[PDB]
Amino acid sequence: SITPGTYNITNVAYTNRLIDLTGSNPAENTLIIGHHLNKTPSGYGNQQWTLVQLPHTTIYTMQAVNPQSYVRVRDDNLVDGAALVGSQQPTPVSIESAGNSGQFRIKIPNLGLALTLPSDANSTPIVLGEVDETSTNQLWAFESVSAV
Amino acid sequence: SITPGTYNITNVAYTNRLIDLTGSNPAENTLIIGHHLNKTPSGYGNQQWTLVQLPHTTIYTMQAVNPQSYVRVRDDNLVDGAALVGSQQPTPVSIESAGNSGQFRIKIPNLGLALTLPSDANSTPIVLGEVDETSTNQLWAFESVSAV
Numbered sequence: 086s087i088t089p090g091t092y093n094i095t096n097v098a099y100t101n102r103l104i105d106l107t108g109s110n111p112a113e114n115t116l117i118i119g120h121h122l123n124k125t126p127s128g129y130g131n132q133q134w135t136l137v138q139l140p141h142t143t144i145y146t147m148q149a150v151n152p153q154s155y156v157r158v159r160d161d162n163l164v165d166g167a168a169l170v171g172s173q174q175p176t177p178v179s180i181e182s183a184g185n186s187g188q189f190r191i192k193i194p195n196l197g198l199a200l201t202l203p204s205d206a207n208s209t210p211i212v213l214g215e216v217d218e219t220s221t222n223q224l225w226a227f228e229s230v231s232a233v
Numbered sequence: 234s235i236t237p238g239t240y241n242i243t244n245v246a247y248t249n250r251l252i253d254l255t256g257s258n259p260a261e262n263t264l265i266i267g268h269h270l271n272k273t274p275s276g277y278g279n280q281q282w283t284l285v286q287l288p289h290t291t292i293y294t295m296q297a298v299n300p301q302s303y304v305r306v307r308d309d310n311l312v313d314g315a316a317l318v319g320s321q322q323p324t325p326v327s328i329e330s331a332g333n334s335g336q337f338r339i340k341i342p343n344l345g346l347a348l349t350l351p352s353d354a355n356s357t358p359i360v361l362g363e364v365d366e367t368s369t370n371q372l373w374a375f376e377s378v379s380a381v
């Protein structure tokens with residue numbers, strides 16, 4: 086399982102893309118997108134995500150460092166194609182190991198849906214897609230944000 | 234949401250029945266049943282349940298005081314009629330208020346299934362059943378345990 090802590094999160098199909106909250110904006114319904122790294126070595130606070138775990142399970146919340154918005158599915162509408170956005174309230178996610186070491190799926194608990202990135206263009210929105218075991222557009226890797 | 238802590242858990246249709254781990258047995262796959270209170274004022278450790286919450290959500294685990302077994306759906310088989318059992322691996326549950334003051338449903342997240350007690354017969358097993366708006370055999374209330 087991924088240990089609790091603060092991370093950058095990169096896509097496996099598109100290795101030059103991080104999970105990013107548009108414009109560092111705290112408003113409801115601000116889009117979550119794929120984007121190039123925006124500061125060396127670990128980004129500004131809109132590309133750093135704090136993971137909190139329910140012990141002895143694979144269930145987590147995800148919250149940005151600055152501003153302090155959670156990851157949520159828009160309008161709590163748990164269907165194929167729905168948008169990911171920033172909000173004052175989270176959607177709980179299940180972070181599940183895949184076939185290769187160090188690759189994870191970010192899944193909706195108990196439903197056949199997962200976070201996916203459909204293109205390499207900068208600022209493409211992240212959306213839900215059907216589970217597909219080997220599709221690298223819905224697999225992700227974690228890099229720690231290390232402080233002193 | 235219900236405050237974290239240690240509780241007895243009584244059915245709303247059948248107020249003489251507590252959630253109980255059969256025989257205080259530590260084995261994997263031991264049945265969870267409805268049963269009369271087994272000690273004054275708050276039972277032994279097989280009738281006392283500790284609730285741990287994921288912050289800013291309604292998702293919890295449930296663990297008995299002695300032996301220290303979690304609540305699990307048998308073989309992780311999330312369908313109508315499946316058995317509830319004791320195990321070292323928990324199933325995450327969503328605990329949601331029902332309005333009359335102090336009453337709740339104990340649901341499987343994102344599915345229309347909930348813990349149900351089918352009869353008042355002593356030692357009847359607890360199973361999954363479908364959610365509705367009116368039946369009292371899928372509603373539960375809580376008594377705090379005073380450790381001292």
Ligand SMILES: OC[C@H]1O[C@@H](O[C@H]2[C@H](O)[C@@H](O)[C@H](O)O[C@@H]2CO)[C@H](O)[C@@H](O)[C@H]1O
Binds near residue numbers: 254255257268271279
């Ligand atoms: O059978 C449910 C009931 O078991 C009690 O424990 C019994 C056990 O079943 C029996 O095999 C034995 O030899 O004596 C034990 C003590 O009477 C539990 O105490 C009760 O809470 C239920 O779980």
